């Protein structure tokens, strides 16, 4: 006998209650604070991804995300998870086998690999994939019951997140002034909203062998909101030079821009500290809280 992290008996039973017969190799990730993620082989010879909600509050998010993915399936020139199982105890989809555009071993803080900066195919295809996403009609989002934020609601959300952080944490004075200046800087904010992925960075982008964008995963934050939400992580990973490339191609591909968009993206990236801190707070995890407080108190 060998102790293994996965409880195969329980996993089999859970999957079989929803029409999936597990058989063969699997792999498990318990790092997630909200889901257990298992990649398992099924009797169709295929790997499937099991997204297992940990708690009732997480389960409640399954049905609205299912509606999002159902709408998005035909409206994107790349793959998204096909939630053939979607219920409160289990989400399951056939694995999109293409690699993520960042590879990182579970538990590690350092990736093994990130698609290279000088990958022209990745840069170009990510820019056109993003333009396609942001071109999904708002009417389709509304019909799918998505969370919708007008430009005013988008700005208010940011203000509310900042204010929650200010109530709960002690924040570096220059940071606070930075966020407030941004919130007051009318020229920075867009006068429209788009369908956004909401958690978009190289870790949630899939690429084929040639490094062409072939899919996106983890759509749990998707909504109609500020387009720049989906560009801040590109700036973080690929820098200003990469952002500049992104924005030229994005616009050429029909993505709607505005004059201070690059500025706004950098301000959105700074605002990541708020997002992180609220994630830390809402999780109650002490290591995440320690990191968040340290960051918030630190000069940028
Ligand atoms: C654009 O701004 C980003 C910038 C940066 O975005 C992150 C990212 C993706 C965050 O994940 C996101 O964290 C939020 C709180 C929740 C979110 N989803 C679960 C919902 C999750 O994906 C991380 C904090 C994940 C985390 C904690 O394990 C790490 O510390 C890991 C080691 C992380 O540094 C690396 C993998 C680097 C290479 O990733 C990048 O920097 C991207 C750009 O951190 C975010 C807070 C900002 O929103
Ligand atoms: N290549 C690939 N990896 C996947 C797929 N689904 C999940 N993953 C991996 O599983 C990890 C975490 O899964 P995810 O759905 O993000 O869990 P969450 O972050 O808790 O919402 C991802 O970051 C991927 O590495 C998929 O279809 N294809
Ligand atoms: N606005
Ligand atoms: N969600
Ligand atoms: N969520
Ligand atoms: N969302």
């Amino acid at each position: 006998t060998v102790v293994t992290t996965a409880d195969t008996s329980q996993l089999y039973a859970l999957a079989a209650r929803h029409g999936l017969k597990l058989h063969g190799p699997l792999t498990v990730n318990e790092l997630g604070l909200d889901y257990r993620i298992v990649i398992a082989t099924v009797d169709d010879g295929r790997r499937w991804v099991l997204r297992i909600p940990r708690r009732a509050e997480v389960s409640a998010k399954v049905e609205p995300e299912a509606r999002v993915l159902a709408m998005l399936k035909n409206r994107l020139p790349f793959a998204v998870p096909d939630w053939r199982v979607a219920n409160a105890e289990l989400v399951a989809y056939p694995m999109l086998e293409d690699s993520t555009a960042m590879v990182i071993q579970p538990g590690s803080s350092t990736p093994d690999w990130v698609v290279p900066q000088d990958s022209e195919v990745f840069a170009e295809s990510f820019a056109t994939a993003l333009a396609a996403l942001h071109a999904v009609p708002i009417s389709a989002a509304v019909d799918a019951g998505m969370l919708i934020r007008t430009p005013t609601q988008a700005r208010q959300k940011v203000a509310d997140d900042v204010d929650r952080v200010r109530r709960e944490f002690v924040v570096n004075d220059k940071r606070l002034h930075r966020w407030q200046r941004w919130l007051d800087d009318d020229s920075s904010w867009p006068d429209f909203s788009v369908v956004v992925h909401g958690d978009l960075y190289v870790g949630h982008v899939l690429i084929d062998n040639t490094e062409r964008v072939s899919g996106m995963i983890d759509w749990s934050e998707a909504r109609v909101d500020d387009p720049a939400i989906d560009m801040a992580a590109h700036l973080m990973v690929f820098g200003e030079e990469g952002l500049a490339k992104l924005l030229l191609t994005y616009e050429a591909a029909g993505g709607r821009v505005w004059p201070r968009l690059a500025h706004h993206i950098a301000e959105r990236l700074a605002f990541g500290a708020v997002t992180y801190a609220l994630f830390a707070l809402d999780s109650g995890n002490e290591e995440y809280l320690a990191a968040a407080k340290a960051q918030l108190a630190a000069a940028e």
Side-chain angles (χ1 to χ4, degrees), residues 2-300:
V2 172
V3 173
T4 52
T5 64
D7 183 339
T8 53
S9 289
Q10 281 304 304
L11 289 170
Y12 179 93
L14 171 72
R17 288 199 291 279
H18 303 279
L20 277 175
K21 197 167 109 164
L22 307 185
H23 185 70
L26 66 93
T27 314
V28 64
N29 192 320
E30 298 265 335
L31 304 167
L33 297 180
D34 290 353
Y35 300 80
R36 170 180 323 109
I37 307 288
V38 178
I39 292 179
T41 306
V42 177
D43 69 337
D44 57 2
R46 214 163 171 187
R47 285 183 279 175
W48 282 63
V49 176
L50 312 176
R51 281 174 68 77
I52 306 169
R54 294 185 173 276
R55 299 177 300 285
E57 56 263 37
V58 183
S59 292
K61 306 160 126 74
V62 169
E63 182 277 348
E65 186 172 357
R67 298 181 61 188
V68 176
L69 287 165
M71 179 274 286
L72 285 174
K73 180 67 188 164
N74 292 353
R75 293 175 170 83
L76 301 171
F78 50 86
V80 302
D82 179 15
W83 284 12
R84 302 198 191 163
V85 180
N87 60 74
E89 59 169 6
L90 176 65
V91 163
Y93 53 97
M95 193 193 172
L96 301 178
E97 299 185 303
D98 281 344
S99 181
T100 48
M102 176 185 67
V103 170
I104 188 161
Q105 294 296 308
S108 174
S109 167
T110 303
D112 288 352
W113 177 86
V114 177
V115 65
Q117 173 74 263
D118 67 350
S119 185
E120 306 92 335
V121 169
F122 180 75
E124 171 76 14
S125 69
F126 175 74
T128 61
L130 193 57
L133 180 54
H134 289 175
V136 168
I138 305 297
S139 59
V142 173
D143 285 334
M146 291 181 64
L147 166 63
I148 308 296
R149 293 195 180 112
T150 63
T152 303
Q153 292 169 323
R155 198 157 169 184
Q156 183 73 53
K157 171 53 173 178
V158 168
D160 296 341
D161 285 352
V162 169
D163 287 332
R164 190 176 169 215
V165 167
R166 285 167 62 187
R167 297 189 300 266
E168 298 283 354
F169 295 101
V170 158
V171 183
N172 176 264
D173 61 327
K174 293 179 188 207
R175 269 190 202 274
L176 284 171
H177 295 19
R178 185 186 185 161
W179 301 334
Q180 182 68 67
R181 281 194 301 265
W182 176 43
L183 278 163
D184 285 338
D185 180 5
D186 292 336
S187 66
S188 185
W189 295 81
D191 44 346
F192 65 100
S193 296
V194 299
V195 173
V196 295
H197 176 288
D199 200 7
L200 193 58
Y201 77 116
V202 284
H204 292 161
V205 177
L206 310 185
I207 58 170
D208 69 20
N209 56 344
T210 77
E211 301 175 336
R212 183 172 313 278
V213 174
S214 67
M216 297 177 186
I217 61 174
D218 199 358
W219 290 83
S220 69
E221 305 306 301
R223 59 192 189 257
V224 162
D225 205 330
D226 182 350
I229 290 160
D230 282 345
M231 307 170 185
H234 195 80
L235 170 64
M236 190 158 245
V237 172
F238 303 106
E240 290 180 345
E241 81 177 318
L243 176 64
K245 308 197 313 198
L246 169 63
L247 296 185
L248 293 172
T249 297
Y250 175 83
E251 178 179 11
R256 184 178 171 179
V257 299
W258 59 103
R260 292 261 277 163
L261 170 54
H263 173 82
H264 189 66
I265 292 162
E267 294 307 308
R268 272 275 174 190
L269 179 56
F271 170 80
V274 173
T275 305
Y276 186 80
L278 296 179
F279 178 92
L281 187 61
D282 287 331
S283 81
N285 179 271
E286 298 316 308
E287 291 66 46
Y288 291 164
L289 284 160
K293 298 175 312 180
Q295 180 174 39
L296 289 175
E300 280 187 354

